[PDB]
Amino acid sequence: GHMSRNLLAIVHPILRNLMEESGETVNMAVLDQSDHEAIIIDQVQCTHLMRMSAPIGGKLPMHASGAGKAFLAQLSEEQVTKLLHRKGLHAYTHATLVSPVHLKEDLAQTRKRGYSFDDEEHALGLRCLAACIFDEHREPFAAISISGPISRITDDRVTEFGAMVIKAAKEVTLAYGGM
């Protein structure tokens, strides 16, 4: 499935809603199946002075980011192993899953859990939760995420945050099909 500008306008209402509810910046990122890259293509920023603010068109690391890992957690260990050298498991922070053992392990927990979770892996003090968007062939082509500072995305809101992003992704996957 591809991301048409038309579809974005239809779904925008979902990103705005998740923003108000979570109180954090919301992003929509598309999966580049040719280059294996998570590209931000939409965003609704929260109003807090201190917040996450990525540039539209910005890329996200596949192994150390909400959207990245929410995608990576869809590919086989062989595929993953490919991107290990294909892309690169760069070390953004001491928490970054630089070792494929742990990574693949977290990737596993992601599918189980439903939503990815970057805990200060992409940047110090940043938390992120993402959940894939599905086309017709049940293929994940997009990912919706909530990213904010740990000071506000507290440990006891993680699950409540992970649920919000499921409810919003589901709402996009369905509203998508048949329009």
From Swiss-Prot:
What's an example GO BP annotation here? glyoxylate cycle
Listed A to Z, the keywords are: DNA-binding, Glyoxylate bypass, Repressor, Transcription, Transcription regulation
Q: Name one GO molecular function term.
A: DNA binding
What result is annotated for mutating residue 126 to D?
Loss of promoter binding and tetramerization
Q: Which GO terms describe its cellular component?
A: cytosol
Outline the extent of the IclR-ED domain: 7-178
Annotated residues for binding of glyoxylate: 66-67, 118, 128, 145-147
The protein's superkingdom reads Bacteria
Assembly, per entry: Homotetramer and homodimer. Homotetramer in its active, DNA-bound form. Homodimer in its inactive form.
What does the miscellaneous comment read? Glyoxylate and pyruvate occupy the same site.
Which protein is depicted?
Answer: Transcriptional repressor IclR
Organism this protein belongs to: Escherichia coli (strain K12)
Query: Lineage of the native species?
Result: Bacteria, Pseudomonadati, Pseudomonadota, Gammaproteobacteria, Enterobacterales
Gene that encodes the chain: iclR
